[PDB]
Amino acid sequence: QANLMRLKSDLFNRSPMYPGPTKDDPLTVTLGFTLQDIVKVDSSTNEVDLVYWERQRWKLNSLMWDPNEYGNITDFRTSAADIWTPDITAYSSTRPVQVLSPQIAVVTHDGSVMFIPAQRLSFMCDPTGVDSEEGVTCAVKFGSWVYSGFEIDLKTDTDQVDLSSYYASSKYEILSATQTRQVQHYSCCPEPYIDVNLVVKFRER
Amino acid sequence: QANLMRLKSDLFNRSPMYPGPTKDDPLTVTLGFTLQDIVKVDSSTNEVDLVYWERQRWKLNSLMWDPNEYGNITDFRTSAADIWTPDITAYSSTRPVQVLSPQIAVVTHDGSVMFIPAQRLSFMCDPTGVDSEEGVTCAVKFGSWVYSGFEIDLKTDTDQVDLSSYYASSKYEILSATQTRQVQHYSCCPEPYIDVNLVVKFRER
Amino acid sequence: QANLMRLKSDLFNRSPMYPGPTKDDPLTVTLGFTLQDIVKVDSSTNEVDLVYWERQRWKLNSLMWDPNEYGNITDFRTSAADIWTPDITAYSSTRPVQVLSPQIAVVTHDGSVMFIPAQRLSFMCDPTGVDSEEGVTCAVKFGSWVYSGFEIDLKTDTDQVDLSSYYASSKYEILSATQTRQVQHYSCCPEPYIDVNLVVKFRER
Amino acid sequence: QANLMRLKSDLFNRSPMYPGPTKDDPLTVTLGFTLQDIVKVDSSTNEVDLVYWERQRWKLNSLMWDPNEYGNITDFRTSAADIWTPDITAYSSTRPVQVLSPQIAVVTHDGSVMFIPAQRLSFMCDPTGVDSEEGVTCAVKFGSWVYSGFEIDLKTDTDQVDLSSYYASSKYEILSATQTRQVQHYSCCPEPYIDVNLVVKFRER
Amino acid sequence: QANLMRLKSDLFNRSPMYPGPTKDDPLTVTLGFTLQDIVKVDSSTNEVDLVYWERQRWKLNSLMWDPNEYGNITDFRTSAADIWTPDITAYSSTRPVQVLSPQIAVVTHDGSVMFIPAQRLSFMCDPTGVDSEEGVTCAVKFGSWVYSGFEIDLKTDTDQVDLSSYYASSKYEILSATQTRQVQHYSCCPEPYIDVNLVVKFRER
Ligand SMILES: O=C1c2cccc3c2[C@@H](CCC3)CN1[C@@H]1CN2CCC1CC2
Ligand SMILES: O=C1c2cccc3c2[C@@H](CCC3)CN1[C@@H]1CN2CCC1CC2
Ligand SMILES: O=C1c2cccc3c2[C@@H](CCC3)CN1[C@@H]1CN2CCC1CC2
Ligand SMILES: O=C1c2cccc3c2[C@@H](CCC3)CN1[C@@H]1CN2CCC1CC2
């Protein structure tokens, strides 16, 4: 406990928090999705509710330490409130997102952080055709709300959404599920914005 | 990170927060709306739910800096809780507004601030006729709850509500959508109050 | 900004907060209602939902200042959390009251405070007869939860509820709406309690 | 204000906050219920919703003062967050309890505290027979979650639930309503736990 | 009070909080369930809601004391916010878990902590067959969200879920209810992970 208390103290009480990335010191955030269930489809409002886990990873020089200085501690867990986290948001949500898991991150001595919030999201999706063989496709994208591509870049480790924890007795069968990095330009802004587009095709039964 | 940490420290830890505008030092806030979806219409209570983004912009002398003094930083992102924000509210809401996006603002070296909260709002609207060709019109206005025109003035950059992110498969088609600055007088107060009236005409299909 | 910062500092950081009224220094609170809409009537549970604004006014010697000492500032706005506010509550609510407006008060150099929270309230009301010509009457009273008439007295400026912002396309037509000071005696306590009874008669169409 | 400010200051500065009772210094808490309405009955889930006020009273020697030392102040009001409160809870709730009143307590110069939260509670009750002449009986008990009878004892001033503010036009007529101190033994623990059982018999009309 | 105030001060104000377990100083958490009611079954979304109490127990050296040094105090109660608690969570929840009890723990002089949050949980379960004689079985597992078996080991004192507080008039009869420790290795990770699987078989009537 003593070494870990000392490490945490040195990292969090002896320097200011990371103020976030800039053009001169950009940050890459890696993002993948584990889809656990499609829990609700509402055809009168065109809303669909998912439960999923959002794997986020990034790295900061300010979170590095030498394990030999701290009794060979190579990683630790800490409340997400103790560290900077990126402002990744769903772009087509219809309700505030509901957090289903403790808000705790894993920090490793090379400065890398892993944060995996489980969440329920309501989003815009017309589910007409969900009860046919072809099913229906919807999409929702995730990205920084206020940082451009020049400050926060996103990547994925894979194009396939992790379906290995998908609820075996869901009302809905997943026909396809992809996660794809996209570069968007909007008319407002000259800077590109980066998102990951989660596209899920699904049907009943 | 070092220059940005120093800038933030100089701005936020070395003087009190801006106490808000007065008659002697008024403020102009620019306001525009991006309508993303009409998500619910309830004819038994005359409530309609929108999801929209509220672009807000204003400028403070107390947020200015010379980029040459701070490693050429010309702007940065910061939690909206670190700065004064204006008390703009919907005047005919029926439920507390639900915030859908991180509460983070962009501050620029000329002292200008941009804040773009995405929100779900329930408001008073009789939707009778929504299922006809003519559709139905409702309106909701937005302005400061407690500052008059002598302290906070509003303007818009345009009269047209931004419909470029409107959900392509909404239950509702937008026939018209305007945002108009208006001057209101209340019996309580001799000073005029300023609002922006969001008038949306829409129908099913 | 400098004068206002100095005033706020002198008022709030240089003495303790007002600890509330006592028998020796009672306080009069003025109370008036602006009824904006009857948003819901539920005959299966006997609940009715209103949206209204509650004008509250009181005066404290400890909030006085000479405008000549503070660059001629005669009033300012401040977060309701910076000041004492009275514990006025609805006595027949069925859900926590939902605040619809920013919680900001106006303080004037004579020590008077104006606070106007907009609210949605669910309360006990049997709406049988709402769909007839005679309509239906319900009532809900508002007063301090724990201060007796010896500490907090209530008055109204008028007996008529302000209907000038009542939603023109409500499901419900207001036949009558009054606000009336009353004295209540409880078996527990020898001291009378003061409330304002809001009585609204209404019907459909 | 001055004497009261001084009293509050002196009481805040006497010790840390009361750490709660122990075997060596137990505490008796007095408990009574005012039943305001039965607001909802759900026979598909066996839930019933009540609105009631929970009178709680206890006494601490550390909160005593001589009124002659403080300009004859014999009592004052203060936020419930400024003092220790007991952990009395409903034992068969199905939803978090909703607080309907300001969280303010009354402290008296003999060290007694009165706290009267108004609340809406959903709880386990099979309402079969509610629509007959005999009606239906349900029960919910209230006690400390973690203090045994050796640390917190409960009493009631009366066996009869106060029905004097029961809503005159409720869907439900109250046939009987009692509050009875009981001793419960759990298999986990050798110590008895004390609760007050609120038993309400009621029917429609 | 005096001795207890001194003990709490020595434990909580004189050293940092426990930073959680590591490979070098692991922790065992004991876990058991008291099932109070199955409150809702939804076959259109495959969600089931339970109300249960989650008994958690662990031990820390940093929470030990000699009772002779503190007026023979052998245990005390304290807000769960004063101490580290483990991040045990349901792995297939569909909603944020609702806490139904005060968040207070019992600490004993040997450093052991008992924490018993009562909760309402919605989780993934297909309730087809609930209305037959055989009934239906569902399952949900609980474990640390971020600590492996090398940091947090889980055990149960018994395989049987405590049914002694199960609501006598539930819609649902419990045919079987078990809690079983399971040790997993996943391909992603070299560390073993531990969960407790709560398996409940039930039917109507
Ligand atoms: O709409 C604007 C916008 C409009 C006019 C000026 C500016 C903007 C930028 C922020 C600075 C300058 C951000 N956004 C949105 C925030 N988020 C959602 C879409 C865009 C991009 C990412
Ligand atoms: O009702 C009052 C009011 C009443 C009596 C005195 C005063 C007021 C002002 C504040 C100044 C002094 C604010 N308001 C509301 C705030 N907002 C909504 C309606 C009005 C105007 C715009
Ligand atoms: O029940 C009591 C009560 C009981 C026993 C002692 C005392 C009380 C007072 C507070 C002082 C002393 C307030 N109340 C409630 C708070 N509010 C609503 C109902 C009553 C009256 C006004
Ligand atoms: O289950 C236990 C329990 C189990 C093993 C040890 C201990 C307990 C006590 C706390 C002290 C030591 C409290 N409780 C619950 C909390 N509350 C409700 C049910 C009981 C009784 C009162």
Q: SS3 for C119-183, per residue? A: EEEEEECCCCCCCCCCCEEEEEEEEECCCCCCCEEEECCCCECECCCCCCCCCEEEEEEEEEEEE
E157 sits in the region (left: phi over 0; alpha: psi -120 to 50; else beta) called: alpha
For chain B, the C-alpha Rg in angstroms (whole number) is: 19
Q: How was this structure determined?
A: X-ray
Is there a contact between C93 and D76 if contact means CB atoms under 8 Å apart?
Answer: no
Residue D9 φ/ψ, nearest 5 degrees: -60, -50
Is there a contact between A71 and E24 if contact means CB atoms under 8 Å apart?
Answer: yes
Alpha-carbon distance of E137 to E172, in angstroms, equals: 12
E133 inside 8 A of chain A by CB: no
Segment (H or E) for D3: helix D2-12
| In chain B, beta strands by DSSP E | 27-42, 47-64, 75-79, 88-90, 98-99, 104-108, 110-115, 118-124, 136-144, 152-155, 172-184, 193-204
Residue C131, CB half-sphere, CA atoms under 13 Å: how many?
4
Q: Is C151 exposed, middle or buried (CB count within 10 Å of its CB: 0-12, 13-18, 19+)?
A: buried
Residues of B in contact with A111 (CB under 8 A): none
Tokens of E15: 């050293």
Q: Which CA distances in Å does C18 have to B33, C51, C83, D59? A: 41, 30, 8, 25
Checking B11-14 for CB contacts under 8 A at 24+ apart, the result is B11/B62, B11/B63, B11/B65, B11/B107, B12/B82, B12/B83
Nearest alpha carbon to residue A174 among A197, A198, A204 = A204
Question: Would you list the DSSP string of D117-181?
Answer: -EEEEEEE---TTTTSSS-EEEEEEEEESS--TTTEEEE-S-SB-B-TT--TT-SEEEEEEEEEE
Q: Which are the contacts of D69, defined by CB distance < 8 A and separation ≥ 6?
A: none
Q: What is the residue range of A88's domain?
A: 1-205
Number of domains into which chain A is organized: 1
Alpha-carbon distance of D195 to D183, in angstroms, equals: 6
Alpha-carbon distance of D162 to D56, in angstroms, equals: 14
Angle at A187 between CA A185 and CA A189, to 5 degrees: 70
Nearest alpha carbon to residue E46 among A38, D148, A144 = A38
Pairing mode, strands C27-42 and C152-155: parallel
Alpha-carbon distance of E132 to E203, in angstroms, equals: 7
Structural contact between residues B46 and B172, judged by C-beta atoms closer than 8 angstroms: no
Alpha-carbon distance of B93 to D180, in angstroms, equals: 45
Facing D46 at nearest CB: one of E2, E77, E169: E169
**What is the SS3 assignment for D97?**
coil
For chain E, where are the alpha helices, taking DSSP H only?
2-8
Residue A148: Cβ within 10 Å count: 17
Alpha-carbon distance of B177 to B199, in angstroms, equals: 6
Longest CA–CA span in chain E (Å) reads: 61
Residues of C in contact with D71 (CB under 8 A): 24
**What is the SS3 assignment for C148?**
coil
Residue E41, CB half-sphere, CA atoms under 13 Å: how many?
22
Residue B72, CB half-sphere, CA atoms under 13 Å: how many?
3
Residue B114 Cβ < 6 Å to ligand 1: yes
Tokens of C132: 């007839």
Question: Would you list the DSSP string of D9-56?
Answer: HHHHTTSSPP----SSS-EEEEEEEEEEEEEEEETTTTEEEEEEEEEE
Question: Would you list the DSSP string of A96-139?
Answer: PPEE-S--EEEEETEEEEEE--EEEEEEE---TTTTSSS-EEEE
How many residues in total does chain E contain? 205
Nearest alpha carbon to residue D94 among E46, E101, E130, E168 = E101
Residue A171: Cβ within 10 Å count: 20
**Å from CA of D189 to ligand 4 middle:** 7
Nearest alpha carbon to residue B187 among C74, C159, C104, C32 = C32
Please count the residue pairs, one from chain A and one from chain B, whose beta carbons lie less than 8 angstroms apart.
75
Whether chains B and C touch (3+ CB pairs under 8 A) is answered by yes
C39 to chain B, closest Cα gap in Å: 6
Tokens of D24: 């060596």
Alpha-carbon distance of E3 to C28, in angstroms, equals: 45
Mutate to test the pocket of ligand 4, among E114, E157, E166 (most ligand atoms within 8 A of CB): E114
- The sign of the torsion formed by the CA atoms of C188, C190, C196, C201 equals positive
Alpha-carbon distance of D109 to D195, in angstroms, equals: 28
Is there a contact between B47 and C36 if contact means CB atoms under 8 Å apart?
Answer: no
Q: Is A62 exposed, middle or buried (CB count within 10 Å of its CB: 0-12, 13-18, 19+)?
A: middle
**What is the SS3 assignment for D191?**
coil
Alpha-carbon distance of D107 to D8, in angstroms, equals: 11
Q: Is B198 exposed, middle or buried (CB count within 10 Å of its CB: 0-12, 13-18, 19+)?
A: buried
Alpha-carbon distance of E164 to E159, in angstroms, equals: 15
Nearest alpha carbon to residue A118 among A162, A168, A75, A155 = A162
For chain A, the C-alpha Rg in angstroms (whole number) is: 19
Residue D68 φ/ψ, nearest 5 degrees: -65, -25
Residues of A in contact with E45 (CB under 8 A): 39-40, 171
Alpha-carbon distance of B125 to C100, in angstroms, equals: 17
Structural contact between residues E135 and E203, judged by C-beta atoms closer than 8 angstroms: yes
Alpha-carbon distance of D170 to C123, in angstroms, equals: 12
Segment (H or E) for C4: helix C2-8
Alpha-carbon distance of E13 to E1, in angstroms, equals: 17
Alpha-carbon distance of A83 to A145, in angstroms, equals: 18
Q: Which residues are D105's β-sheet partners?
A: D78, D115
Longest CA–CA span in chain A (Å) reads: 61
Q: Which are the contacts of A14, defined by CB distance < 8 A and separation ≥ 6?
A: none
Q: Which residue has the tokens 């009860």?
A: A131
Alpha-carbon distance of A199 to A48, in angstroms, equals: 13
Q: Which are the contacts of E37, defined by CB distance < 8 A and separation ≥ 6?
A: D46, D92, D94, D124, E50, E51, E166, E167, E170, E172
A107 inside 8 A of chain E by CB: no
Residues of D in contact with E39 (CB under 8 A): 45-47, 94, 124
Nearest alpha carbon to residue B132 among B199, B40, B205 = B205
Alpha-carbon distance of E144 to E88, in angstroms, equals: 4
In A, residues 154-193, which contact B (CB 8 Å cutoff)? 187
Facing B89 at nearest CB: one of C55, C102, C171: C102
Segment (H or E) for C49: strand C47-64
Structural contact between residues E117 and E99, judged by C-beta atoms closer than 8 angstroms: yes
Total H helices, total E strands in chain B: 1, 12
Nearest alpha carbon to residue E143 among E135, E133, E157, E153 = E153
Alpha-carbon distance of C129 to C46, in angstroms, equals: 12
Alpha-carbon distance of A141 to A161, in angstroms, equals: 13
Q: Which chains pack against D, by 3+ Cβ pairs within 8 A?
A: C, E
Residue A165: alpha-carbon gap to chain centroid: 17
Residue C170: Cβ within 10 Å count: 20
Residue E95, CB half-sphere, CA atoms under 13 Å: how many?
15
Which CATH number goes with the domain that contains C116?
Answer: 2.70.170.10
C30 sits in the region (left: phi over 0; alpha: psi -120 to 50; else beta) called: beta
How many residues in total does chain A contain? 205
Q: Which residue has the tokens 């369930």?
A: E33
Nearest alpha carbon to residue B138 among C168, A92, A44 = C168
Pairing mode, strands E47-64 and E118-124: antiparallel
Alpha-carbon distance of E162 to E177, in angstroms, equals: 8
DSSP state of E13: I
Pairing mode, strands A104-108 and A136-144: unpaired
Q: How far apart are the first and last CA of chain E?
A: 50
Residue A120, CB half-sphere, CA atoms under 13 Å: how many?
19
Tokens of B27: 């403020």
**Å from CA of D146 to ligand 4 middle:** 6
Q: Which residue has the tokens 């603002």?
A: B105
Q: Which are the contacts of E66, defined by CB distance < 8 A and separation ≥ 6?
A: E109
Alpha-carbon distance of B182 to E6, in angstroms, equals: 63
Residue B100, CB half-sphere, CA atoms under 13 Å: how many?
22
Q: Which are the contacts of E13, defined by CB distance < 8 A and separation ≥ 6?
A: none
Longest CA–CA span in chain B (Å) reads: 61
Residue E6, CB half-sphere, CA atoms under 13 Å: how many?
11
- The sign of the torsion formed by the CA atoms of B144, B148, B152, B158 equals positive
**What is the SS3 assignment for E127?**
coil
Residue C87 φ/ψ, nearest 5 degrees: -90, 45
Angle at C139 between CA C137 and CA C140, to 5 degrees: 160
Alpha-carbon distance of E157 to D99, in angstroms, equals: 37
Q: How far apart are the first and last CA of chain A?
A: 51
**What is the SS3 assignment for C13?**
helix
Structural contact between residues A125 and A91, judged by C-beta atoms closer than 8 angstroms: no
Alpha-carbon distance of D115 to D57, in angstroms, equals: 6
Nearest alpha carbon to residue E12 among D56, B19, A4, D16 = D16
Nearest alpha carbon to residue A143 among A89, A86, A94 = A89
